[PDB]
């Protein structure tokens with residue numbers, strides 16, 4: 149049977165959650181995607197020789213801590229916590245997203261990857277060392293991405309699948 153991995157992409161508005169998801173799905177950079185569209189997209193991929201089905205939830209809805217929103221986020225097996233390297237506030241929000249994931253999954257060990265997006269841009273405000281160190285503090289991997297150039301896109305989603313595999317085993 150083909151294993152399906154449910155991946156959820158989270159982070160502050162405008163960090164590039166949709167552009168990253170669409171690069172994985174379409175193999176195309178989409179600079180404009182309605183910031184309110186929250187949807188799931190599937191793609192069959194080969195990761196370490198195993199053909200698997202990715203189901204990616206690209207988050208966008210209003211901040212809401214209700215039984216309904218918690219249950220929808222709880223379907224995720226692994227999470228990408230995205231910030232933009234030129235937006236300090238998005239990096240400073242990361243701990244909130246991790247805390248909410250741990251809470252809905254009722255687990256101290258949820259497969260997770262820290263993603264520093266917009267790596268193509270020159271006006272960086274978050275040092276790579278600070279981002280590597282945040283990931284080190286949590287015991288999770290860190291991946292530098294650009295949805296514009298496709299830098300790190302497969303690395304981010306594929307590392308998350310590998311983290312899910314380790315957790316299940």
Ligand SMILES: *N(C(=O)N[C@H]1CCN(c2cc(O[C@@H](C)[C@@H]3CCCN3C)nc(-c3noc([C@@]4(C)CCCc5sc(N)c(C#N)c54)n3)n2)C1)C1(COC)CC1
Nearest residue numbers: 158161209210211212213217218221241244245248249252
């Ligand atoms: N974009 C904009 O403002 N978008 C909205 C929609 C999402 N959103 C938001 C804000 C937020 O803020 C916290 C960091 C902060 C801490 C104190 C309370 N608030 C104000 N947090 C979230 C958020 N946090 O967790 C989520 C999840 C989707 C992550 C996975 C786990 C769970 S479980 C659960 N329930 C939820 C939820 N909700 C999550 N989301 N979201 C702000 C703009 C762009 O304009 C430009 C308009 C500003």
Ligand SMILES: Nc1nc2c(ncn2[C@@H]2O[C@H](COP(=O)(O)OP(=O)(O)O)[C@@H](O)[C@H]2O)c(=O)[nH]1
Nearest residue numbers: 161162163164165166167179183266294295296
């Ligand atoms: N230069 C650059 N712009 C990006 C990148 N990813 C997203 N963007 C831009 O950032 C803005 C928000 O992207 P979007 O995917 O809508 O973010 P979301 O709200 O997290 O889904 C848009 O203007 C995008 O063109 C990237 O890696 N590089």
Ligand SMILES: [Mg+2]
Nearest residue numbers: 165166183208
């Ligand atoms: Mg979006």
